[PDB]
Structure formats: structure tokens, C-alpha cells
Write a protein that binds this ligand. Structure first.
Ligand code: HEC
Length: 76
């Protein structure tokens, strides 16, 4: 899947406005410290969930590649 496609059907729900502290999409400054953790780490976190974010980020068919693509789209 394309990163933007994953975002538009799932991630945008909370990340478009940065609800409950979600790093806002296309906010490079907000995503920089999170990207710095390493993509492997971020993909793992999305799949297990983190606080207010539910495991999977409401994508029902996402591969690790899909998750990574989605993060890359949001991070700029
Ligand atoms: C609301 C129900 C969310 C949906 C749907 C998605 N995300 Fe999320 N995400 C959400 C919150 C509230 C937060 C902040 C959590 C915190 O306590 O900091 C996040 C954070 C992320 C992160 C950063 C995790 C980290 O280690 O700091 C990533 C990488 C992330 N979200 C990715 C992501 C993707 C790819 C999604 C779509 C598939 C997605 N999120 C959906 C809330 C919500």
C-alpha cells in the first residue's frame, strides 16, 4: 500500500489534527524525535499500540512496509 493511502483510510483519524497528543501529520518538528527512535521501533509500537493509540492504528490489513510508508508520509 502507498503511505498516503494508509493514512487516508486510517491514520488521519487521529493524526490529521493531532488528537490526544498524536504527532500531527506533516508536522516535521513533532515527528523528528519520534522518527529518531528508528522506524523498526515505530512500526513495532504502532502494532502493539501506545497509550491512546490502539494496536494497529486502525489499519486492518497493514504490513510492516505499509506502516513504515504511512509514518514516512506523516513525518513530512
Ligand atoms: C487514534 C485512534 C489514532 C490512530 C487511528 C492512529 N494513531 Fe498513531 N498515535 C496516536 C496517538 C494518540 C499517538 C501519541 C501516543 C503517545 O502517547 O505519544 C500516536 C503516536 C503515533 C506514533 C508515535 C509513537 C511513538 O513512539 O512516539 C506513530 C509512529 C504513529 N502514531 C503511527 C500511526 C500510524 C502509522 C497510524 C495509521 C496506520 C496511526 N498512528 C493511527 C493515535 C492514533
Amino acid at each position: 500500500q502507498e503511505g498516503k493511502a494508509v493514512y487516508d483510510k486510517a491514520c488521519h483519524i487521529c493524526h490529521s489534527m493531532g488528537v490526544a497528543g498524536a504527532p500531527k501529520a506533516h508536522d516535521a518538528a513533532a515527528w523528528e524525535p519520534r522518527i529518531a527512535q528508528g522506524l523498526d521501533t515505530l512500526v513495532s509500537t504502532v502494532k502493539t499500540g501506545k497509550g491512546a493509540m490502539p494496536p494497529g492504528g486502525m489499519c486492518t490489513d497493514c504490513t510492516d512496509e505499509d506502516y513504515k510508508s504511512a509514518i514516512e508520509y506523516m513525518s513530512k
